[model samples]
Structure formats: structure tokens, C-alpha cells
Target chain A: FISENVRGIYAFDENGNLIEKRYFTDKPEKVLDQLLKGEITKDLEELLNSLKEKGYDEFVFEHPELSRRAKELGFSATTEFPNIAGERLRSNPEEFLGENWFEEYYKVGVALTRMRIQEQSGARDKMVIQAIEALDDINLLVARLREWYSLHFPELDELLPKHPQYVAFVKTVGHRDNINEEVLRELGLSEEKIKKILEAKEKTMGAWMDQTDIEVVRQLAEEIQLRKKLEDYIDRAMDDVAPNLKALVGAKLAARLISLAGGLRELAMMPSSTIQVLGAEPKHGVIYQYPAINRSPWWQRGKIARALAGKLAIAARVDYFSGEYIAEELKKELEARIREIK
Target chain B: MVEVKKHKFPGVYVVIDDDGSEKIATKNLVPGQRVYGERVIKWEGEEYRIWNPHRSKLGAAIVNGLKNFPIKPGKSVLYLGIASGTTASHVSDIVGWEGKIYGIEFSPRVLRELVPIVEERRNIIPILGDATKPEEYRALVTKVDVIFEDVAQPTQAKILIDNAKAYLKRGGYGMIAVKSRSIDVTKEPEQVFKEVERELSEYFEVIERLNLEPYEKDHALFVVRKP
Candidate 1:
């Protein structure tokens, strides 16, 4: 019987309750089952008698609470009672309770439990989603900055198509009138490009802006820098969490796959067919358009998705179970496969 | 002064406050231990933990006048979606040390919060895995007397049926806390409840259905027993 404390055992007995109780010695020579079942040997009986002589009359229990109290009472206790339900569940010796079933399942449970604990403790999947969001924000920031900066120097939009270069150019030459060779040199532009930019500055069709407007453009550039830092963090996180997937699809696409699948483990469990169309629109009609059957250019998107999904499936599996660094070879093979299709 | 009076439901008691508000409580197995920031009051030489209906569905069901209480001392339970062990801890108090609780949770982040509570309470075994895949952790879990599921998945009823087949003993009890919004937002809550009842009739004999109204919004508690 389970009790809250060892003192409760004494209390129950003093109250004249006839609960099922058994005496346990510090060192029982026989098996626990033999002693509990009342199969008392001559040596065992003597040990019980000696313990009773020492005023230890309370019956010992194998329950966790009782064992804890037993330890405090200057006695050792060990669990001997088998869980009845556990025994019944394992009664079928062939299939359900096969040899090493406990060991195998315990290992699986431990691994799954560890994975869950890791997922709870801030997994890299969160970073992947954050990076994707940051990338979207950067695009919006760049679009607004270009529209604002182009109002002053329209030619810079064609000359500096790259986002970082455009932002740098705007910051270096705040006003179209201030477009000098020294400022352009600091921006790492060629001497010929600087001469052309200065000539365009003279014949500009853009509007003039005050200091307040220029300060807003500089803040947008700073936001771009912050976005780049967030992307770098996501890259490092993806590499750490799913090295094989990152090597196959690149950091940005790998993160997108993880986000679409909900988590890394979910992505690993998905079939190659499902992975291929991770971002494809959900089909709503009965007779869906079969682009692949017609061999049309419209089917190229489906073809690419299928190809990418096949490789991602293998990469996700490797990252999840083996943690092997063989994705580089798989990536090369995918490139070759794409070349063959071309 | 708080007076502890036993409720009609076994293992549950009502603590009548001086202000006359009836507070549902569980007789604490670990007398001085407080789980999940619940208020503990000592009365009649025993500690009783105040059960908050707003935070836990079981508490809500009790407050909403659920007739049967299958959970008792010395009975093992398999709890699904045991997020941070809020309700599971109280169940632990009810079952005492003789009973065991095998808690299954999907989220790792939530499991971290539950780990400390499980450590303090020796009877609780927290398994970090998806409840949808019961076979994955079948070896670790044995046949339990009761199965309590609180997963907010669309397939909440299906999950309970699957786990019941795997871990629940014959003639054992099971409870599913079904959130109508989690199943289908478009359909009426009553419609969703009807669908769940129809699905559950195939495997279990539905004993009682308690709507946790006022305490919980759009929530229904299904109590069943396997044939």
C-alpha cells in the first residue's frame, strides 16, 4: 500500500487498520517476489525478528514516496512491485513485447523527447521564419528608397541597379549639385562613371529635397543594413540546424522549405512529391490543369518544383537522422541532372 | 475561514470562502507542494489546491457540473497535449503517488516548462513527441486506466481514438476536450460536436457530453468508455 509518509504507516497501524503490509530487511537474501509472496525462509524469518527487536515494526514499501521516507529513516529501499498494466500490455510475448522491445522503444522515446526538448529551447526554425520575414521587409524598404532617391537623380536608378550600391550612392551624394569626383571615388565608382554622373547632375529632371527628407532616406539605408544582418543570422542558423538542406537548396530556399513545412522535423517526414510543390497554390478544381502532359513552357514551374523536391527530400533525411555532410555531392548531382534536362 | 467540503464527485472538494464563493479544489497528495501557481489552503489538517476553471478545461467541466469523475487515487492516466502540466499537475494530486501520469506533448518549448514540474512530482513521466503518432512512443507507455486528451488539432477526436486503441485498457475511461474553433471555424459549434459524437460512436460508448459554457467558450467535454 502507498502512503504519503513512513509515519503514516505507523498511524494507520495504530488505528487498528488491517491493510496489506510486509516487513523488509536492509538486506533480503531471497528475491523480492519470494519475500512479498510470504515464502519466508528460515534465514529471512530471523532477519525480520531481529529488525522487530530493534523497534522497526512498520512495513516497508516500494512506492516512490515511501522509499523517499525510508531513506530519511536511515534505511535503504528498492522498487520491486511490477506495474500491473505494464505487465498486461507486455503479456503477448511474440509481437508487441518482442525481444529488446523495451530497449528499442525506450531509445526512440528518448530521441523523440530530446528532439522535443531542443525544439522547445528555441530551435533554429524560428530564425529561418524570421529571416524570410526580414527579407520581405528589406524588399519593401529598397522599393521606397529607390522611388525617393530617384526623384533627385533619375539616372542613378539605371546606373546603380544593385540595392546596396544605390543606397551607398544616395548617401555619398546627398544633393545632385554635390556630385563631385571625390564623393564618387569614395563610393568606389570608376573615374569614367563619375564624369558621366556629374554630367547627368547638370541636366537632372529630379526634384529638390530638404535636410529632413534626406535624413529619412539615410534611415531607410540603415534599415537595409539591419535586414542584411538578420539574413546572415538566419544563414548561420540554417547551416547549424539543417546543414544538408542548406547545401542542396541554399540558405534562403532551405528556410522557405522549413517555414512551409512548419518545422525541420516536419520537413524531414514529408515525401519528395509533397516537397516539390511546397509553395504551389492549392488545387481547388476537380479537373486540374495538367501542364506536364502538354509539354508546354507553363509546365516548367512544375518540373522545377519536382526536381528541387527530389533533392530536398534526401537532404532533409540526411540532416535529420545521420547529420552527414554529403549534401555537397548530392547538390552537384542535382546540377548535372538539371543540365541533362536542359 | 475556508471550509473544505467534499463534492459529489470523488477526489474533488469545494472550498467555501468567507465571501460565499464556491471554489473547486483537489486534496493535495504532496501536502505542502504548490503546482502551476494555484492557491493552496490548509483545512482539516490537509492541503487543498484551488482549481481555476478559466485556466483548465477539467476545472471548467467541474464548474459546469460534469456528472462523472473517472479519475481517482491509485489509477494511472495517459494525458495528451499536457501543455506545461497545468491540469496534469492537479490530476497528479488527485491520483497521488500510487497513480502514474504519462504526459505526451508535441512542442519542445512547452516541454521545457513542464520538465521542472515533472521533476518535482516523481509520478509524472513527460514524453516529448507528437500525440498523432502514438506508435512512436508505444513502448514507453503501458495500458492506462484512463486517457485524457486536450489537443486542439482539427483531428482531436481521431487522435483520442487512436491513442485509446493503443494504450487504453478494455472498459477503461477516456475524456477529450474538443475546441470547436480548432476543428472548423465555418461550421456551427453544435454541428462540429455532432460530427465528433458520430465519429466517436464507432469505437467508444459515449457516456456523457458536458458543454463547458460560461467557463470556456465553444468547448465541449466528451466522456466515454471503451467496450
Candidate 2:
């Protein structure tokens, strides 16, 4: 029997050629009438059981809904059956069922499988890496902007030391000629600082930049603000996906851990030793860049990564399975341990 | 009025208008289904689309005179490196609802665009995983009749071989779109293709090799069948 909602019955001969097909109406009694009329055997359940005993139990189903119903009725059904018989069915679905079986099957079958697989995969871990990469690109762009702006107004680099403040100052003061007490005051700059900036602007050795150059700086400054907003979004995303890891290593580093491990569950399953070198270059020994490692005359960077990894392993486990809010304590423990190591 | 004519390849067709412009399309398995913005032309109680050769390398290969159309209606295919599912959508159209295409994409960002298309086309299953590591998503997929690899990684051939061994059924067909610069910018395009051919010959019997010129530069399409 070809088990489908619309066309409920199929009587095939021993050669597997379809002998008769029955279309069902909505009423339950109509289904019974159709089944009884289409029957070529003595008993339905007994015949099905005999087929099962003879190892012919595997039934072909076009839809997951039908396969599920076939299983519910104690007959084994396989979706794989369609793979072999699909060509014949495609050419003449209406010949058997009086309508295309795929019209409804496509909607339910693909949607169900897609939902199952996507749920199993960690979409958040991937997002964290994307956000981190975007942030990295924007940071590099900001550095370039700083150097380009410095060519025209080198004094402002010294005046506004912070990156965001420098970007704001660039956006506010379009040109050196536009720099004044009122503009500096609007930027909440101190009078003494404004006086120093104005003095440098007057005697500056910098060349006059065209309107295009000023516009480029303004665009870069706007991008910096956008990057800041994206970081805030990533921070919130990390908190939602891996709260304990975020609490332990902070959002940015937590994201890096997830990214390195491929996913949160993968990180949780990993050994503390493996987690220690999660973000370390596989073939390089460049951990000396970390100030903590560099400053500690005795301890190496590998030792620091190991110390951080131990707590991060615990944090990832909690985040993955239980999601307990004990990462704050773990962070304190990790900091104290690092101090002791130093 | 629109007119539909079957192309030499099975499941592929050309829809012609009275104005003389023609479109390469698949016989609509799912009528009224618009995938990847390809226009669906309904005529003679059938549907077709203009399969552009430029955007899709498979389309280019067919237009370039590919001999075998192993990917047909009702054949299962494992599509590796499906970025945004532009070409995969056409493959989905060819496969119809009865056929299955397990689309594996490494980037979650790309998968974001692909998943919606897969949702509409029930035959394509979106697998978010690395193609290089077949063992990672081995359980999610089954043995397939065709393995189509378009991953432009330096190790694209190796990836195709690995996935073919893991998932391709015996006597299955494999197609790899070899991007020359992606393998090695230092070497000549011919040299890169020769090196990739040598690597692939270990597992698969190379059937046809076609250059996707004008449509894509420095690209070669290889069709092979597992012994």
C-alpha cells in the first residue's frame, strides 16, 4: 500500500506492478470503504505481518508524514525508497495518485529536515567569529585613518589620544582652518587644550587637504562609530549564546574561544590542555606579545594560556550544558592563580 | 507567447519568446517555484527558466559542450562548498522533489542566504559544516550518485576526493570546478589543472575536461566517475 494522505491505497501484484489505486475522501468511513474495495488479500494485518516475517517489511513512503503513520501502524517505512523509484514517479505521479505527490511532500519534508540539522549546529558560534573578523577589519581601517589624518593634522594625533575621541575630533573639525574655540568648546575640550591645538593649527607644516580628503576622513570616522555599535551587538550576542564563557573571559575573548573550538559543545568537550592553546598559532611561538607573559620575568606565555584555559574549560562546560552563573567566581579564581604563578 | 524546447541534456530545457530571446531552464518539477531570482516561464502547461551561463559554472560547462549529464531528475547529489546556492538552485531545479541534494557550506554567513532557498526547495538539505572534514557531517548525509565540488580552496581536489570516498556510491559521478589561482597563483593555469588532474586520477577516472572561458577566467571543469 502506498501510504499518502490524499491517495491512501495501492494494490500491487507479485511483480510489483501497480494493479489498482484508490483515492480517499476526508471521512474515516470513506477510507474504510476504499480500503475494502481495493483489497486483493484475505487480511491486511496478517498479510503485512507475513511480509515482515519474510523480510519484506521495508515499505516505501513519499512523505515523512506518511512514513511516520506507517510506523505508527506497525509497518516499517523508508524515505530512501523514493531515491530508486523517483524517476518513474516524477514522470507520472498523477498516474498513481491522481495529483503530484511532491506538491505537499516538498513543503513538509525539507522544512522538517532543515529545522533538525540547523538546530543541531551552533549558529551563534559562527556569528561570534564573523563579528570578531568585522571588528578586526574596522580596527585596521581606523589605524589607516589615523595615519592619513596625521599627514594633514599631525598635532590632533597628540591632542586626541583615544581612538574614539580622535575619530570624533576628525568628524567635528573637517579642516584645520575650521578649528576654533567654539568648535573645541562644542567638543567639550578644555580651554588650555583648545589653545594648544589652535597654536599648532596656525604654524602647522601640513599641506592643505582638498574637500575629497576631508570627506574620506569623515567617512572613516563614521565607520568607527558603526564598528563600536557592532561590538555592542556582538557583546549582547555572546551573552545570549555563551553567558558563562562571556562572564569568565569577557565577550570578545569568549567569542574567540568559541570560534577557535568551532562551537560551544566542541569547546566544552575539549581538554583543559587543548583549551589553553585554543587561539595559539599551531606552528608559531608568539605568545611573548602578551604583556602579562612579557612582564613576568619567570613565567612563559604558554603557562599563562594554560592557566586561563583551565578556567575557560570549566566556563565552557557550564555554558554548554548547565549554564550556571558561577563564571564570576571562576574568573576570580583564575586571576588569583595567575597572580600566584607570577 | 513563450515556447518550451528540451535541450540535449535530460531535465534541461530552453524557453523561447516570440522576440527571439531564449532561456535555459529545467522542466518545472515544482511549478511556480522561483529560485535565486531566475525567471520562471510558464507555457504549454509547463514551466522553465533562463539558466544563465555566466553566473553558474555548471551552466557554462553545459554550454561549453559537456558530454555527460549524470546529474538528472531523481538522482541524489552531495554538493560541497555551496556558497549562497546560486548554481545549487539550478541543480535543485534539475533534481526535482524526488531527488535530494545535500548542500554543505562552511560559512554560516553564506548558509544564512542558502537556508531560505533550501526551505523553498524541499529536495535540497542545507548542511552547515566544513567540506574538508567529511567525518564531521558524514552522519547527516547518505551515499549519493553524484558529488559536485566547487570549493575554490587550495586543496579543492583533495576535499572533493575525501568527500567522494566518504559519500559517493560505487559507480557514482563527480564534478569539480577547478579555480586555477585558488590552487596556486605562482603557477600557470594549465600547470595548476595538470597538478589537480594528477591528484584526482588516484580515485576517479577522469571523463571530460572543459574550460569555462569568457564566462569565468582561469577556471577548468572536470567530470569523473568512481571506478
Candidate 3:
């Protein structure tokens, strides 16, 4: 059974009797508000501000009532919002903020807002499909990486008793390679260009190899160096290869979704009883059976597709607020995007 | 019962149990002139190697015990640390053509040799990955009815428990082949079994503990049911 997300809702009917009762889903909003207002580092403050500017305020445009409540709770949302909508869609940005602010405002502020709410209702439909595809890509990469690693460092292959993580890392390497290949393709690199890049990798490391006389240490060091370079190349390549396509989508996105969908840490911290309350079914008497997913069909399908579209206007506003939260968290976590390896 | 054949490796015969539990025998066996002795075992023109029970603790677990093993020929299994497809080949026969066996092995060198054995048997779908983190392979497998863990790591028990939680069905049974020497060579076999059993009891019901003596020494076989 799954935990129920709804709570703290003082439900009422015409008779004024409590029709139903549940807790609110946005626990982080309340908690983070307090944390932010408290003594915070300059870096954290900047991150928070950046997130707010990007449309992640206590009172998002969609939630006027929540806005009022937040202001009452002494949380302010007075920053000027960025015109980020549709900026993500453009192959190359003519202007970073985007043009046609009024059109985006209307489209996202009204049309997309309503559509997003309708979409988040059904989210888990093609989960298996996505999962399967991911596995296929990952497995293919693992096989290729193993072959590559074995060919390059026969000693390491023979020594390590085949740890599973090593295999997974190999897959990750392959997945990253696919992304790198695409990035090179996107950047319009010819076969010679690709070979030159590979040669450069060999040359840089090859010079290091000449200095080190210890064969065992050299093998280990070389493998590590090669792996780091390969991983970076893969990351850069993926961002460029399918820039806006599903091909660019990686597990980090899924991990982020899991995080903001309700901080996994909080879920972990909750007592078994509290978890049962959050995730259980009252009538069924089973635990973790709450169908936040099965109950909301439209929202699920629409939000996934909408979020995937990169239409920042709508993307900025929707996602059960997960998109906004994750984007903020990601900004803080991935400050130096290039340096932060997966 | 799975068929047993005496091989050139004296005392080490090949076993093909009723549910097709095969192993290369090392002890407690009657010698036969021919390994297969015209048993006529061929599927898809590929010969199935006989794994002797006395030679492998895994085979002994299947032959002497394994009430929890749902070997009725259509139940999926997750086989961890499948080395050289020795025991996996036997498991394939037990599951038959309809059921699938997802075998996770970390050794690529072993996989290179094991792949053909697995390929020959359509029932075996060898997955090259770590058993510790089953999440990576979660997509390749649906909920399995049984998990046969034969990893030769002291941490084998933990691996099985984690894999069971991630991929095995609720109420699924697990046959964990525990190698005492892998975990602690100096420690008594009984002590190692107790420690592992205690750890397993947290998530599974330790239904039976079989000591692989006479068949294969210094090994413990645990049959557990996930609650």
C-alpha cells in the first residue's frame, strides 16, 4: 500500500459537518519557509532567491488562497517573476528570458495552469514503459563498457571478483557514452573529429603513463583517470546529443521527482504509524495502499508530458509543485553543473 | 529424483534430480561407467550438463531439501552469483521452458563462458550485474516467486535479503546457499549459520537450516520464506 498525500484539509458540507479530513501535502513549504527565514548562509539565501525568481514562491500564481495564507504566516512572495516560459523549448535562445511575455502570461497563467491540474491526476501510466526503455539502454551500455574496460585494463577485470556496482558503473559509462556520441553528433563533429577527441584522451593519459613506472599502480590510476574523463564526456555529450528529446532524460530527473514528490527523507523519518496513516487505506485495512496515483489519472499523464515539453511558462507553474521544488533543489545542489558528476 | 551420473572426477558424478537439480559430484556417490549413460537429455539440440549434488551445496539443497522451492514448472526465480552456469543449468530444467530464471553474475569472464550455457537453455536469462543492488535489474524481472542465492561472499545473506525485498514476491521462498569459509574461515560453521540466520530472521522466516555434510562440507543451506 502507498501513503496518502492529502491531509489537514478541514472538509465541510452544506450542513457544516466535517465531511472528511486529511493533512496537507505541502509540508516542506511550511518547514522550508521557517528554515529560510532563520539564520541562513549567503549561498542558501541566494539559492532561495533564485528559486523564488524562477516562480517557486510560497504563493505560486496558481494558489491565491495559499498566497494569502502564506502572507498571514509572514512569508512574502514579492520578487519579480522571470519570463522563463517557452525558453526551454527553443533550440537556440534568441533571448534568454524569452519574447512575447504577455502571450506566455496568458497561456501559462490561465490555460496551462488549468491543463496542468488536469494532467497531474494520472502520472504512473507509462512508468513500466519508461523503466523498460531505461533498462534496455542501461544494459546495452553496461555490456559495451565492460568490453571496453576489459580490453583496456585486463588486470582490473581479472582481479575484481565482479562486484555488481562495477557492472552498474559500466552501464552508466555506456549510457553516458551514448549521450556523448549524441553530443558530438549535435556539435557536428565528423568521424575524424571524433577520432581526434579519442586520440586526445589517449595522449593526455599516455603522457602520465610514461612517467609512472609501477605497472600495478599505473593500471589502477589509468583506469580511474580514463573513467573520470569518459564520464564527463558522456555528461556533456548527453546534454547536447538529444538536448530537448527524451534521449537526454536521465535517472537524475526521476530521482529528483522522487525527492520533491515528498522529501524521501521525511517519508523515511515518519513513524510506521504515521507512514501507515499517510500511505494506508482506511477501508481496506492494509498499509501503504493510498491511491494518490490511481485516483488522479488526467494530472498524471498531462503533467509528465507538460514537464517534459520544457515550456517554462507552464513548466514553471505546474507539476504538483514538484517541478518548482526540484528545480530549486537542483539549482542549489548542482551550483557548478559541470563539476557535479552524477 | 534428479539423475546422478559418475564422471571422471572420481566421487564427483553429475546429478539430474527430479526437478532437474544437477551438479558435478565430489563425494558420497556410486560410480557409473558413462556420465549420462544414455539418459537422452537434449533440448533444442543443446546438451544439458549434469550438476552433481554431492559436488555443489546448491544442488544438495535442491535434492535433499527445498520444500519452499516452487519447482512445479512455471514459477520464475532470481538466481544470484551464477558461476559458470553449473547450477543455473539445472534450475532451468526445473523451471521448464515457460518459467524464467534471471541470473545475476558480476564476473564478466565467467559470463563469457556462462553465456553459451545460458543461451542454450532458453529458460535462463543471465543478467550481468551485482546482486547487492537488485534495483538496477528490477526492470528485467517481474516479481519472482523464488530467489536462489548462491553468492560466495560473507555478505551473501544480506545480499539475498536485499534482493528478496526488491524483486521477490511477498510470501516468496528463498534458498540461500551459505559458504562459511567465504564469511569467516576461522569461525565455526554453526556460528556463521546462526549469525546469518539471525540476520535473515529480521525479514524472513527461517523455515529450515540444512548442513551440507557428506554431500559438500563446510556449507550451510537455509530455506527462508518472506513474510
Candidate 4:
């Protein structure tokens, strides 16, 4: 019987005697190489190759993946190879193996658990969502800055509606009188926009913003740099985590669902209808943000959302379990349902 | 004048607040050290950290008159879901210097917050791990007298049972704080708790159940002993 577990792989002969055993060395990362991938590692491939020439033709395994792998490699392996007669085999490797083997295995086990927890907890998605949420607060702070900064430079408010440009201009030139052609160009304002800004600079009805007031706005504007590359970071990191949910309901929305549900597992466990309206209230909850659904008639929107949620429910489960890239299939199914709703 | 009196559970104390209201606390294991911004009181030449029930479910149970708190001085405990050292720090204080606490937490973010606290509170050893899979941390944590689980997992009862079977000594006690909504929101809180009790009763003798209302909504604490 050949069995592989967290401790490592072991091969027992027909006489129930241990012949070849390869324990995982030092790091959990090394031992866990290609785990759950159903692919054979060099360490494992080396073991299988060596065992083929010398050992019996028949092979048996305790794990299904290894058993199937053995069969593919021209060896007949059964998963139900019961070789023990006592109570369920003790989990402690310290029983047959010496104390030293158990110690190494133990350290690797702990490290693996820590890694699995981070991945299974959907922690990165949660972190990304939290960063997005913090970004929201920063945007809202900038809006407040714009509204308050309007008291000093009202024309700048309408001229520079975009948050970053407004913040940059306010931070660079505190007073309306400070808006010169060079300063406007340095701030990246176009010629037409700069002309309008310069025209409004003189005889401006708004009160003057002193260095102290602009310093307060500068502190808030400094946080505006929290964006840009963060979106790039989120996009790159999000590919492997929840591709189906992203494909169905956009990355940020998909991530928000996972975060609000606590994690991927938690999202998968939620009921179909609950997953439908995870964020906000009513028939067109947070899923209302979808372009098609948002634009649809108010009456047909619920049916479309219901269908959308039904697909998303499966998407969540699929992502959590196998993490297979079945996004196109799920997207197709959602489209079919939407077509049916029409 | 502030006064400190010993509580029914060993290592716990009752501090007579300056306004005549009573507060539960533990004798500061590390004198003059505060874990979560709880008030520290000095009386009769001894220092005490006032335990807040609102912040800790176990403290809520104790304040709500829970009987048979298995944790005592010098008794080791396995704490699961010890987030940010809010409750486990008090458990550390209760376990005292001689006792040991193996705390398992899943989030590296939360565990990082507890690192500095555990530095001085040497009795509590923080381990980054998932409590659902106790075998991972079995190598580090030996058999313990008590197991406490505060994680609001849907399978909260099963988690306690699995961890107890793995680490708890025979006749050892298990504590679980049940959040009714987390388990099953459709069912009434009483029904959810009854189902959880039945599930736990299969593996342990249910000793006491405390309703942690006011401090916590739709929450119950169950103390069970391994059969």
C-alpha cells in the first residue's frame, strides 16, 4: 500500500512491511509544491519511477489523486487499499516514525495551515475591498475639500470638477491671485481651461485661502495618491482569486460580495436569494450596478437580477471549490437567462 | 476608596468601583500592563485589571452568573479565534504565570496585533493557524484542561468538538460562544441554540448555558465537559 499525506508518502510491501518512504524535507512550501493540483512532483515522480522497476505490478493508494495519477502512469492503483486491522490508524506519525521525523513534519504542517488560512479566508480580496473602501473615504474627503475649497475659489470648483486636478491646483496655488500662466501650465491645465481659470483668477468673488487653510487641503490631497497603481494592483491580483464572480459582476462588485459575506466560503454558503441582494436593499440591490440591469425597465429588472444572482451563486461555489476558470460558461449562462427574461 | 475582592473563580476579582457599582477583574499577571484599555485599579497594595463584559463573551457569561468556569490558575487552555487579544489577554491573566495558553488565530492581520501583547504576557503563546484543523497545531499544543472557541463560524459547535477530541485531556472542559445569527438566521435564537446543544451533547455533557444578552445579542455560551 502506498499512501501520501501531510507527513509525506509511504510505500508498504505485500507483507505489510515498510520498504520505501520519502518524508517531506524542511519547508512546507517545498513539500506543498503542486499539492491540490493533481500533478506529480519531481520528488513524487522520482518515487513512482523507482518503485515501478523493483516493486510489484499492483499499487494501492489512500489518496484518490495519487491513485488516479498512478493509474495514468501504467500502474493499477486502488484508493480503498485497506492494509490496517486496528482502530483507525493513529494520526500521530511519531508512532512508527522516530521523534525527529515527527518534529519536521509538525513544523511543515503548521506552516501549511497558516498559508491555507490566508488563501481560504479570501484575505487578499478582503484587503483589496478594504483598500477600495478606504479609497471611497478618501474620495469623499476630497469632495468635502472641493466643496469647502469652493468657498475660497468657487470658479475652480466648476472649472476643475475632477478631484485630483482640483486637489493639485489647490495644493500648489492656495490663493486665486497665485494662478499665473506658468503655474497653470505646471499644474497640467490645458490652454483653454487655463484661460478660463486665469480669467476667473482676477475679480474672483470667492474669499482668499491662506497658507494654513491650503496646508489642511494639501494634507487631504496627499492621500489622493492612494489610487492609480492600486487599481492596477487589484486587477493583477484578482485574476486568480475569483475570475467567475469578476466575469459575472465586475471585479470590485464581486470583491465587495466576498468581503460583505465575510469570505469566499461564507459567500458560497449563503442562500441564492441572499447572495442576490448581499449589498443594499430590495429587488435591485447592489447587483443593480450592472449596466444591463440598471438600464432595464424597473419591472423586468427584478427578473434579470434574480437570474443574475442564480448564476452568481453557482459562480461563488465554483470559485471557492475548484477555482476553475469557467467564467465564459457562467457568463454565457447569465446571458441566456437575460435573453429569456426579455 | 476602591476595594478588590476575590471572585468565586480563582484568579478573578471583584472591584468595588468608586461609585459603588461592582466590576469583575483579574489580578494583573504582568503588573501595570494593560491589554485592551481596561481600567487598572490599585487596592490593598495589589493591582487589578478590570474585565469588561461588553468586550468579552466569557466575561459576559461570568458577569451573567455562569457556574463552573473550568479555567483556573495553572490550568492550560487552548484558545481558538483569539482575535486581537481582546478576550485571550484576560484568559492569560486568569491562567497566571505558571499556566500556558496556546492561542490559535487565522488572520495574520489580527495575529500581528497580538504579538506585542504576548511578548510581555509570556503565558499566552500566539499561534497562527486554523482552529477547524487542529492537527496542524497539534505538534505545538499538547493536551490541555480546557478549550475555548469564540470564532463565529457556522460550524462553531463542530469546531469545538473536533479541537477537544484532538487536544483536550479526558474530562477536560470545552467552551463555545454561539452567535445565533451566524449559525442560522432563519431559525429563532432559542431553536438554533437548542440544535447546537443537541449537537454538542453527542460528544460532551452539557454542564451550563449562559445567555449573554445586553452585552451581546442572540448569543449563548455553553460549557461542556468531555465524556
Which candidate tops TM-score? Answer: 4
TM-score of each: 0.48, 0.46, 0.37, 0.53
Per-candidate DockQ vs. reference? 0.07, 0.02, 0.01, 0.03
User: Mind listing the fnat for each candidate?
Assistant: 0.16, 0.02, 0.00, 0.02
The residue-by-residue lDDT of candidate 1 on B17-81, one tens digit each, is 88988989998777667767988898758888888888789999988888877888888888987
User: Could you arrange the candidates by DockQ from highest to lowest?
Assistant: 1, 4, 2, 3
* Best model per DockQ: 1
Interface RMSD of each: 14.8, 15.4, 22.1, 10.4
CA-RMSD of model 2: 24.3
For A132-204, candidate 1 gives per-residue lDDT tens digits of 7778887787777766777767787888788776677665557777777677677778878877787776876
> Per-residue lDDT of A233-295 in model 2, one digit per residue for the tens?
778577546767786656877777787677778889988777655666734322233446557
lDDT of 4: 0.70
Runs in model 4 deviating more than 4 A are A1-24, A28-252, A255-342, B42-47, B132-143
Model 4 lDDT tens row, A153-225? 6777777767666678766667777768877777777889878887877857876657656675666556566
- Supply candidate 2's per-residue lDDT for B43: 73
> Is 3 or 4 the stronger prediction by lDDT?
4
For residues A119-193, what per-residue lDDT tens digits would candidate 3 score against the true structure?
222332133224334444554544544434444334334433443434432333322223354444444446765
Kindly indicate the candidate among 1 and 4 with the higher lDDT. Answer: 4
